[PDB]
Structures are given as C-alpha cells and as structure tokens.
Amino acid sequence: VPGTLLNIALLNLGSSDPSLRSAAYNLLCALTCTFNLKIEGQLLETSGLCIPANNTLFIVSISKTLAANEPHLTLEFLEECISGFSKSSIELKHLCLEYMTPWLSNLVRFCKHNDDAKRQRVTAILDKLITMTINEKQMYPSIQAKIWGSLGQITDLLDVVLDSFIKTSATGGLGSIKAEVMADTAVALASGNVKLVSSKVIGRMCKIIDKTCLSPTPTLEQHLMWDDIAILARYMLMLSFNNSLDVAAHLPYLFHVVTFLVATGPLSLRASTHGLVINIIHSLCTCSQLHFSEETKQVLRLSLTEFSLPKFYLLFGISKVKSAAVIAFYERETFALTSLETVTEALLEIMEACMRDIPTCKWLDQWTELAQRFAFQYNPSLQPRALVVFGCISKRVSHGQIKQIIRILSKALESCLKYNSQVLIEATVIALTKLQPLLNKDSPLHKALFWVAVAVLQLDEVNLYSAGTALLEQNLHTLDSLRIFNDKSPEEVFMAIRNPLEWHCKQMDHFVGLNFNSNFNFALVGHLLKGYRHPSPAIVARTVRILHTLLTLVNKHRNCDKFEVNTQSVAYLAALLTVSEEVRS
Amino acid sequence: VMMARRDDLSFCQEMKFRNKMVEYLTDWVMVKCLTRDLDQASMEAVVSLLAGLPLQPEGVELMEAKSQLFLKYFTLFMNLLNDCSGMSRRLASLRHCTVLAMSNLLNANVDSGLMHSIGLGYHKDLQTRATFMEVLTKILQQGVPGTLLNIALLNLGSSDPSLRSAAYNLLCALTCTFNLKIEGQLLETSGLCIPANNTLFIVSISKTLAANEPHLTLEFLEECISGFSKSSIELKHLCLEYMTPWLSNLVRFCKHNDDAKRQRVTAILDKLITMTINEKQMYPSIQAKIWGSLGQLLDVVLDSFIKTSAIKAEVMADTAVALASGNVKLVSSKVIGRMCKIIDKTCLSPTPTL
C-alpha cells in the first residue's frame, strides 16, 4: 500500500489536470501522515489547493527525501514506476525518469541478504529498466544518462546488473537488437565506477573463454558459449573508448581476448575486435593515470597508424571494407596463424614500449601466464591461437614447457590418424619458432628442433610447410648465433641427435624415400625443394634464404668460399640454381 | 587531368583561370543518365579546380564579394546534395564528390567560408557532416571555437559511426588549436570506433570545458540552441545535457558591462525560450535541466518571459515554476516586487477602470 499509493500520488501530481494535482497532493499528505513518512518542506492536507502543472522539482524533492528517509518504498516504487512509465506519453516518460532517478541507490539494500525474493525483485526491476531502455528509442540518451548513470555509481549491484544485461543479450545473441543496445548501454554502467564494471565485464569474458575449455568443441564459433563471448566482445568495443579511463589494470586481459577473437566469427565481430585494439592503443596514448614518454607515445601513435593500414585489416579477417568502424556499428579467411603472429608481435611491441616506462606493472607476466594456460590446456579451438601467442610474447622458457609443446604436436598428429589437428600442428611449430631463440645456449633442443622442422615439412601440408620452414629458418639463425657450426658441419650436428633416434629415423627415411644417413645434404635439400612449389612467394623466398644459410654453413666449417662446389655444398648449389644470380654467375 | 598536371603547366593568371572555370562548370551542375554522368564529371572536375584555390571576383568590398561568390558555389553544392538525399552508386559518388568540392572550397577560402560551413555542420546528412568536420580538422591544425565545439559535441552523439569518429577528431583538433584544458586526455586518430551511447563522455567534456573555457559560453550556447532546432529528439536531448553546465557561465557576461554581451545573453535567453515553447516532448525535461539551472540575470529572464508572452504565455508561466526553485527567495522577491511596482505604476498614469 505505501509504495503503490505513493507512486500514484507522485505521478498524478505531474498531470495536466488541475483537480488531479490537488487530489494527488492530498493523497501524498494522507500517506505521509498514515505512514509517518518523514518529510522536509512540510505537507498540509486541504481541499481546493490549486497546484501548478510544472511542479517536477517539488515532486523530485519529495521523492529523494523519501528515498533517503523511507527506503522500503523503493522496491515497490521502481516496479510501479516502470509499469506507469511504459503506459504513459513521452512527456510523462521524461518526468517519470526524473522522479525515478534518486531511488536507485536503495536497490543495494535489498541485495545484501542473498535470499531469493528480495534479490529477485531487484533483478526484475533491473530487467524492466533494461526493457524500458530497449523500447523507448527516443528517450534513449535520457534513460542512459540519468537512470543508467545513477546505476553506474552503485558498485554492489553491478554483478546483478551485468547478469541482467548479459541474459537480456542472451535472448538472441549477436545480431539481436536486445544485445546491440545492451552493449551501447554498458558504457553508461561503467561511467560511474569504471574500474569495477569493466573488471567484471572483462572478468566474465576471461572466465567464459576458460569455460570453453571446461567442455571443448572442435571450432570456437560452434561452441556452447559462443553467444556469451560474442555479447561480451560487443560490450568490450563500446567500453573500449571509455577504457581510455580504464586500461591500466586490464591491458593484458584485453589482449588475451583479442588473441582468441582476432579474426573469428561473423564479419561484424571481426570489425568490432579490430576496433577494440584501435581504441585500446588510443587509450594507452591517453590515460590521465599513465605518464608514458614522448618515445613511448610516438610508438603508440605510429601503432595506431599501423593498425589503421590495410595490412592489419587482412590480419583481423577484414577484407572488402573501407572502414572497420562502419561495419562494427561467413567468408572466414580460414584463419592463418601467421596473421595472429603478426598482430601479437605488434601488440607485444606496444606492451614492451609501455613496460619500460611503467616498472611497477606485471602485464607481460600476466599475459604470459594467461596465454600459457590456454596454450597447454586441451581446447582445439583456442589452444592453437594461445600457443602462437605464448610463443610470441614469452621472455623465458623451460625444457618442461617444450616437452608439453612437442607432446601437443605429437598428439595433434595422432588426431590426424583418427583440419583442427593441422592448425594445432602449425601453431606448435610457430610456437617452437618463437620459443627456440629463448632456449638455453647448451640445450640439446636447438638441434632437436631442426628435426622437428624436417618432420613437419615431410607432412605435405601448405601451412605446415610454411611453419616448418619458418621454424627451420629461425633454427639455423639460432644455431649460428650459438656459434655451433664454426667447428662442425650441420650434417654432423644434426645426425648426432639422430643417432639414438636412428632406429626410428630409418623407418621414417624408408617411408619418405629420402635418406639422410646416405647423404645428409641432399635429403635436407629434398625437403627444401618442395618449398619452391609453395603457392606463396614469401615461402619460396624463405626457402631460398634457408638454402643460402645452409650453403654458407656447410662451407663455414671447412673455411671455404660459400660457392666452392664440393660433395656437401653441391646439393644446395643445385637447389639454388633457378633462384640465385650469385650461384648462376 | 589538366588540374593534376597543373603542377607541370604554366599560368599567367592561374587563380582567375580556375575561378572562371569553376564558374563555367558550375552552370552544368543541374538522357537523364548522361546528364547525371555530366553532373558527376563536372563535380570531379570542380573538386580538382577547387584544390588550394583562393576565390577571385572580377579591397574591403572584394572580401565581401569573395564571400558572396563563396555563398553561391556553396549553396549550389548544398542543393545538389539535397537532390541526392548502379543508379544508387552513381548518386552516392556524386554526393561524395560534392562533399569533397565543399571541402576543397573551404580549405582554401577560410575567411569567406567558415560561417557558411557551420551551416554544413548542422546539415541533415551525417556522411557529409563527418567529412566536413575532417575539413575543419585540416584548417584548425594548419592555423570558430564555439561553433566548431558544438558541431563536434553534437555529432559525437550520432547514430552514424563514421560521424562519431570524425567528430572526436574535430574535438581533438579544437582542443589542440585552442589549447582547451581537458581532463581524461584526448588523442587524435583515424578509425577510432566510438560507441553511439557516449552521452556521459560528451557531458563530462562539456562541463569541464564550461569551467575551463567560459569565453566560449555565449558563442557556444547560441550555436547549440540553433542546432536544437535542426536536430532529432535524441540529439535535442543530448544538447540539453551538454548545455546544462554552460548556462552557469552566462552570469559572467551580464556582470560584464558591454551592451553587446548583455544583448547576446538576452538573445540566448530568448532562443532558450523559443526552444522551450517549440520542443514540447522535451518540455518537462527542458524545464528540469535548463530552467532550474538558470534559476541559480533574473530580471532579464523575467522581462524576456513577459515580452515574449506579450501557448507562449502559458509556457512562460509554467516555466517560471522551475525558475523559482533556484534561490526561491530572490526569484519570488523580484516577481512580487515587479507586481507591487507595476501596481504603483498604474497610479503614475491613472485610468478610470483597472
């Protein structure tokens, strides 16, 4: 009775009808006396009191004084407000939101208890306020500024608010106008207490990405939780411009989200994810809490420029668009891990630049842990992406981590006996590429990884061969940086590691029909020669660099000139014959 | 092609030549398919002709004649874009070219152009607005504050994403060019995909500016209120929120003794009244934001209400309720005081019947 009658009094005090205003005013007086409602600017019952039509500032004053004084009314009052609001005219709807504005504060009181009924009716009030927001497209900045800005102040409730937003978005997932407006509204939630709201949104995203691994599916877009991720990615774009206030706690977690999403799903989500990064880099150039140098700021400015280039559009699985923004507000490029590698090193150069200036951060270590967790754990959709990223970002590695990676490579090849497996193989090989410069100078593994690359090339899959040659290219740079060739042929070094393996290697070579024991240089060249077929001119040119490297190395242990033809160099020279003007002359 | 090669060619009177060429080709800017291709081609040529072109009619009158010639070309381009507002793509290409024509015309002719250009900033077409704001961006970092600040802020509101990014870059440019002191610092860049709901950000920028940059207030508020009349209901609402901080500054201008500044405050209050009368949906919300804040001048306010009343009169009565909530005692003291003084004034020149 107190709440229902108080709303009907207050709302009627608004009216264009004069008799209605007088009657309402007498009802307010009666409620005040009967329920002893403590009121400033005291209230007097009487007939014929000719109250003005514009009294909004009086109704509002009464309401918030009541909202402080008589808080139990709030549960009933806001429920009744939204019921009357939805029925009323647009003029009455402006008035209605103005009087609603103070009440929102009390909504936390009911929530502390965690018994269903109280928490449920606040949750229903939030869903009704959300519904109201979706419906009244011409009240839209008004609702968001006053209702959602006030709710944005209120920390405790934000988990209930976000689960209401997310469940509202869940009603149809990405492409549902319910979700679309909810994302745009989510910025209003953050605007009051940015750090907690964004921490809960990003936290839900991270936790839900982890939940994908709790029950795996082969492909991420298919996953049981795909809509939940897609919704949060939508929110993250909108928030990301406000993240110009936020980023300093978050930056790793946002790149963790980018890493999984970077070119996935329908093209609007890709555009969103490009925008997410652009906005984060811009936010890192201006957060008033940070103090980056002119060099670091210049690096970020040039990074914005770089991310704005068509190169980065192709990396994010955007093609055939002038502006990512326009589409942000399927023709999957079947995702090329080399694109994620490129993005990840660029985001790494952004983070590294910043981390020099902020010595008190843990950002790259947290990103390393987050990526590491997903790289090692079994989840077919995410694990490849994670491996690539972990490899790119890491600053140290252990033989136990390499064991896990090469075990993942092996298990992925077992799964090929039984597309996803291949992408996991490519990922592991890219990971090995980035990780092998990190490995200790006296580790056997540098030499071992040359054979991992050889085995990968043997597979005959276009992207696997590209990855194996990247691994091999980087491996030979690594071993030359370790001086290892200076007193030995590559043949002796790699064949020593084969000797224990030799029982296994014999079976490989006899099924391949290449035999390194009989002639090492020609077998290695046999593998490399397929690289000349490769559809991509970049992989051919890499293959040529590898042959040049090997040619130089074989002669390096003799102390010969690199073009001295001999029983070891000749294979490389014959391989190089269509591609090197230096060899030809 | 000739204009592309203009850097190679020789000219005795290049500026006059290009001026006369735009004058001629603009006559062509008006079988239907071919005439529309002629419009496209003519406009593409005009975009080439206008590229660093100072205007030259055939000294103080010359600057005013240059402004009048600017207004002719500019109006013709506006009409052509209104007419725009395979057949679809040709129209969009003509529109994009027309926008670039305005852009180049402005980029050279700044002293003649800027005032009319603000009229582009209001214009109903969001794509044209966004591009025009990038043109303003070129002028302002090369070498106005109130008019441009409103067109930035109001456009940050838009449903169009490209418009929001463009506006945000314009705000950044104005901030740098006019050294406008801002919290939560602002970074110029392409492709920044700003949300549609950013009202709390636009508002925060506005009131921080309203504290920091009071000299803008008259220039800004008048242009905002003009933009109110142009806008959708959503953009009208947003205008109120960001206007609200600025109102407070208006006292500084009537504390100032300049008759022109006192007049401009009075004209702002008249335009606030005009908006208050016209924009009925908003009207309870307008009263709450605008008239409450203004209630915190008040002779001038009441004379503006009374003179405008002299629905207008009813709205002024009903709005006076909001106005009174400010310092109740002073507002009511002035209303009642005017009543008493006017009743006394009846005796200063009597009539038989009241």
Side-chain angles (χ1 to χ4, degrees):
Chain A
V1 183
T4 186
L5 300 191
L6 178 64
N7 177 57
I8 58 169
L10 295 178
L11 189 58
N12 285 304
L13 287 170
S15 187
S16 68
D17 186 281
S19 71
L20 179 54
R21 298 176 234 140
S22 303
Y25 180 76
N26 283 274
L27 177 60
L28 169 66
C29 293
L31 293 170
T32 304
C33 299
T34 302
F35 299 114
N36 202 359
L37 312 173
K38 300 173 185 177
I39 286 178
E40 170 179 312
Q42 268 282 19
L43 300 192
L44 187 89
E45 177 173 26
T46 200
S47 51
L49 187 79
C50 303
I51 274 168
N54 169 43
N55 57 4
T56 289
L57 300 124
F58 173 69
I59 298 173
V60 169
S61 178
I62 291 295
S63 187
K64 64 179 180 180
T65 297
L66 282 164
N69 294 0
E70 304 285 20
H72 47 283
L73 300 179
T74 308
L75 275 172
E76 295 302 320
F77 187 11
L78 281 170
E79 178 146 48
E80 290 292 318
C81 288
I82 304 147
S83 185
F85 171 98
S86 66
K87 296 179 185 181
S88 299
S89 90
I90 286 164
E91 302 73 17
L92 177 63
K93 283 168 174 161
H94 288 88
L95 152 74
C96 184
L97 299 165
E98 283 293 332
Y99 72 70
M100 286 163 73
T101 298
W103 287 89
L104 305 167
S105 55
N106 296 332
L107 293 169
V108 64
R109 285 186 188 244
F110 316 107
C111 301
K112 305 312 295 183
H113 298 289
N114 205 250
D115 179 32
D116 298 353
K118 298 294 186 177
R119 181 269 189 192
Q120 282 287 4
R121 277 188 60 245
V122 175
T123 306
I125 284 160
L126 298 169
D127 268 347
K128 287 175 183 188
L129 294 162
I130 287 165
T131 303
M132 163 192 95
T133 309
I134 298 158
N135 291 351
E136 297 309 268
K137 295 181 178 176
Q138 297 230 291
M139 299 298 302
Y140 176 67
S142 196
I143 290 168
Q144 287 169 328
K146 301 304 195 268
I147 302 303
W148 293 115
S150 300
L151 286 164
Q153 312 307 306
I154 307 172
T155 43
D156 306 47
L157 201 58
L158 299 172
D159 68 340
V160 188
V161 185
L162 276 172
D163 288 344
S164 310
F165 272 49
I166 294 161
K167 190 171 182 177
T168 299
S169 308
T171 59
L174 183 66
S176 73
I177 293 177
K178 303 100 178 182
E180 304 306 319
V181 172
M182 280 274 79
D184 206 44
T185 308
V187 181
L189 297 190
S191 68
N193 195 274
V194 173
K195 305 203 71 178
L196 185 57
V197 172
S198 57
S199 178
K200 287 278 191 183
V201 173
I202 297 160
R204 280 173 165 49
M205 172 63 94
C206 297
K207 291 168 185 179
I208 287 159
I209 275 169
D210 264 293
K211 288 171 189 180
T212 71
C213 188
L214 301 181
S215 52
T217 64
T219 55
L220 183 62
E221 293 81 357
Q222 297 194 0
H223 194 280
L224 308 179
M225 305 197 78
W226 170 256
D227 301 351
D228 213 357
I229 291 179
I231 287 161
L232 287 167
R234 208 76 172 127
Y235 293 13
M236 290 173 71
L237 170 66
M238 311 311 167
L239 293 160
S240 67
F241 181 74
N242 272 268
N243 296 178
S244 57
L245 296 94
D246 186 64
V247 284
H250 307 134
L251 151 60
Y253 298 86
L254 300 174
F255 289 176
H256 194 54
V257 174
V258 169
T259 291
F260 303 110
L261 301 187
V262 80
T264 61
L267 183 58
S268 63
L269 178 60
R270 301 182 208 158
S272 307
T273 308
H274 172 273
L276 174 60
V277 174
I278 291 283
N279 296 357
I280 288 160
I281 299 163
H282 164 284
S283 299
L284 291 164
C285 306
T286 59
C287 180
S288 50
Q289 301 148 31
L290 304 186
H291 291 276
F292 293 142
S293 87
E294 280 277 41
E295 302 79 9
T296 297
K297 289 185 169 183
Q298 204 78 337
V299 164
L300 300 179
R301 290 166 191 139
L302 291 167
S303 305
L304 288 166
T305 307
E306 182 163 23
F307 277 79
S308 305
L309 306 176
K311 175 184 174 182
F312 274 73
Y313 279 59
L314 293 175
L315 299 177
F316 278 73
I318 308 172
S319 59
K320 313 179 181 185
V321 167
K322 287 181 181 171
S323 169
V326 177
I327 306 306
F329 292 98
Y330 314 132
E331 285 297 336
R332 308 177 195 153
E333 293 87 358
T334 44
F335 188 64
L337 300 185
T338 53
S339 295
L340 171 62
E341 177 207 333
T342 306
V343 175
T344 307
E345 289 198 4
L347 295 185
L348 182 67
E349 183 152 36
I350 283 153
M351 183 182 295
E352 286 172 340
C354 300
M355 288 193 54
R356 302 169 308 176
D357 295 355
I358 306 171
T360 65
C361 74
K362 298 188 178 184
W363 288 340
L364 181 61
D365 299 306
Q366 289 191 27
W367 192 9
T368 299
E369 183 167 47
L370 282 161
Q372 180 196 236
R373 173 179 169 78
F374 282 69
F376 305 163
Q377 204 177 23
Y378 177 82
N379 46 354
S381 71
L382 303 196
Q383 191 176 12
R385 301 183 170 282
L387 274 158
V388 176
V389 168
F390 166 72
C392 293
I393 74 182
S394 295
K395 291 290 184 177
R396 55 195 171 274
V397 73
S398 65
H399 296 180
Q401 289 159 319
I402 299 306
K403 181 184 175 185
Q404 191 67 12
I405 293 149
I406 304 177
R407 280 187 162 203
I408 291 158
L409 169 59
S410 185
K411 288 172 184 184
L413 284 168
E414 287 184 40
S415 178
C416 305
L417 313 178
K418 300 175 186 181
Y419 165 65
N420 305 303
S421 312
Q422 172 186 301
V423 173
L424 186 57
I425 292 154
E426 185 189 336
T428 56
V429 176
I430 294 171
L432 290 174
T433 306
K434 304 296 179 186
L435 295 171
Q436 73 183 335
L438 302 179
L439 280 164
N440 293 31
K441 299 185 181 179
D442 298 353
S443 183
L445 297 172
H446 299 284
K447 306 171 185 172
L449 294 186
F450 166 90
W451 292 111
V452 180
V454 168
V456 170
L457 299 192
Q458 291 165 3
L459 299 170
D460 183 15
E461 275 302 348
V462 177
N463 299 299
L464 304 196
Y465 190 100
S466 168
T469 48
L471 171 62
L472 179 58
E473 176 173 60
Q474 201 67 1
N475 180 262
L476 294 165
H477 277 290
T478 300
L479 289 165
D480 181 81
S481 78
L482 294 174
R483 308 176 159 224
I484 281 164
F485 306 118
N486 294 21
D487 293 67
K488 292 188 176 182
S489 67
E491 166 181 341
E492 288 153 313
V493 169
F494 298 134
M495 296 297 292
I497 298 299
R498 278 191 159 209
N499 284 348
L501 311 183
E502 175 172 49
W503 185 95
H504 307 83
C505 302
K506 279 176 174 183
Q507 291 159 86
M508 288 179 61
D509 281 16
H510 276 250
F511 280 109
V512 171
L514 292 173
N515 184 354
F516 295 82
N517 307 277
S518 298
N519 186 298
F520 170 82
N521 301 283
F522 273 104
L524 180 56
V525 160
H527 299 92
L528 285 157
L529 284 162
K530 198 184 184 71
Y532 285 17
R533 299 272 69 62
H534 192 286
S536 179
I539 304 308
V540 178
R542 162 178 285 153
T543 309
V544 176
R545 291 189 301 240
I546 295 162
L547 287 170
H548 262 270
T549 299
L550 290 162
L551 174 77
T552 310
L553 292 179
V554 298
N555 286 10
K556 193 166 181 168
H557 99 296
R558 294 172 176 252
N559 312 273
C560 293
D561 188 24
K562 69 190 176 190
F563 304 110
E564 176 171 343
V565 175
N566 62 64
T567 55
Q568 293 168 300
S569 67
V570 62
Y572 308 95
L573 293 171
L576 287 165
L577 184 60
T578 47
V579 302
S580 179
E581 175 161 325
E582 206 74 62
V583 171
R584 283 175 285 153
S585 58
Chain B
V1 178
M2 174 187 78
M3 283 287 106
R5 307 298 289 270
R6 176 183 75 78
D7 305 78
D8 294 359
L9 291 155
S10 60
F11 299 86
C12 181
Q13 296 157 34
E14 194 212 270
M15 319 310 177
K16 178 183 160 191
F17 165 57
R18 289 168 77 185
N19 268 268
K20 199 71 182 175
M21 271 287 179
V22 178
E23 191 166 295
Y24 287 131
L25 295 191
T26 50
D27 294 330
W28 299 348
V29 181
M30 283 176 289
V31 178
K32 292 188 176 178
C33 280
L34 281 180
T35 59
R36 193 70 78 173
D37 278 344
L38 170 63
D39 289 317
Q40 182 179 250
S42 303
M43 289 301 293
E44 289 275 35
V46 167
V47 161
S48 311
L49 285 164
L50 305 167
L53 181 58
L55 295 194
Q56 279 289 18
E58 300 190 55
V60 180
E61 287 294 301
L62 187 63
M63 181 169 278
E64 187 163 315
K66 189 177 183 176
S67 184
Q68 290 159 351
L69 181 57
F70 181 105
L71 176 60
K72 180 182 178 179
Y73 294 142
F74 176 99
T75 303
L76 183 66
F77 300 157
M78 287 184 71
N79 284 332
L80 193 67
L81 57 72
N82 297 338
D83 293 340
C84 297
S85 304
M87 176 56 71
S88 176
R89 285 196 70 261
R90 288 169 185 174
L91 205 62
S93 182
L94 179 59
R95 174 166 53 239
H96 177 62
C97 183
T98 303
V99 174
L100 187 53
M102 298 172 157
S103 165
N104 289 3
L105 166 56
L106 277 159
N107 172 277
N109 295 286
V110 184
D111 289 345
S112 292
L114 252 165
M115 77 300 282
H116 311 304
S117 91
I118 298 155
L120 304 183
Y122 295 132
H123 180 283
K124 167 181 172 187
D125 181 317
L126 316 178
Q127 312 312 329
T128 67
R129 285 191 187 166
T131 312
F132 164 50
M133 307 249 279
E134 301 289 355
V135 196
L136 293 163
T137 309
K138 301 297 188 179
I139 288 79
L140 276 293
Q141 272 177 335
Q142 174 181 282
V144 183
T147 186
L148 300 191
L149 178 65
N150 177 57
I151 58 169
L153 295 178
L154 189 58
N155 285 304
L156 287 170
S158 187
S159 68
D160 186 281
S162 71
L163 179 54
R164 298 176 234 140
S165 303
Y168 180 76
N169 282 275
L170 177 60
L171 169 66
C172 293
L174 293 170
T175 304
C176 299
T177 302
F178 299 114
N179 202 359
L180 312 173
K181 300 173 185 177
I182 286 178
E183 170 179 312
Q185 268 282 19
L186 300 192
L187 187 89
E188 177 174 26
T189 200
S190 51
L192 187 79
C193 303
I194 274 168
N197 169 43
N198 57 4
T199 289
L200 300 124
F201 173 69
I202 298 173
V203 169
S204 178
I205 291 296
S206 187
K207 64 179 180 180
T208 296
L209 282 164
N212 294 0
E213 311 300 336
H215 37 286
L216 309 190
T217 299
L218 304 188
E219 286 58 30
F220 178 76
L221 278 173
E222 181 172 42
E223 307 269 320
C224 300
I225 298 154
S226 180
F228 212 99
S229 76
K230 305 284 187 183
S231 287
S232 76
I233 279 179
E234 303 157 48
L235 285 165
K236 285 177 182 169
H237 187 82
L238 171 61
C239 202
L240 302 174
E241 297 292 339
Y242 74 70
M243 283 161 68
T244 293
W246 285 94
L247 305 172
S248 65
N249 296 341
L250 293 164
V251 72
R252 295 176 182 247
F253 296 92
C254 290
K255 258 199 170 189
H256 201 286
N257 297 290
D258 186 356
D259 195 357
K261 290 178 179 176
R262 191 179 188 264
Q263 288 160 33
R264 287 173 72 211
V265 171
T266 309
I268 285 161
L269 294 166
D270 293 324
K271 290 172 184 188
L272 288 164
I273 288 162
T274 305
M275 171 197 81
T276 300
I277 295 157
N278 288 6
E279 308 305 332
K280 296 171 183 172
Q281 304 83 356
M282 312 317 295
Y283 178 51
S285 209
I286 285 171
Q287 286 173 309
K289 303 306 198 296
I290 306 306
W291 296 108
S293 302
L294 289 164
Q296 308 303 337
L297 300 188
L298 307 187
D299 266 323
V300 184
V301 178
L302 290 170
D303 284 328
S304 306
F305 280 33
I306 292 160
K307 187 176 182 181
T308 307
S309 306
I311 299 173
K312 308 187 184 179
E314 289 291 342
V315 161
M316 288 296 96
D318 185 85
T319 300
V321 186
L323 188 73
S325 72
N327 206 257
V328 173
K329 305 203 71 178
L330 185 57
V331 172
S332 58
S333 178
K334 287 278 191 183
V335 173
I336 297 160
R338 280 173 165 49
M339 172 63 94
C340 297
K341 291 168 185 179
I342 287 159
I343 275 169
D344 264 293
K345 288 171 189 180
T346 71
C347 188
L348 301 181
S349 52
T351 64
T353 55
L354 183 62

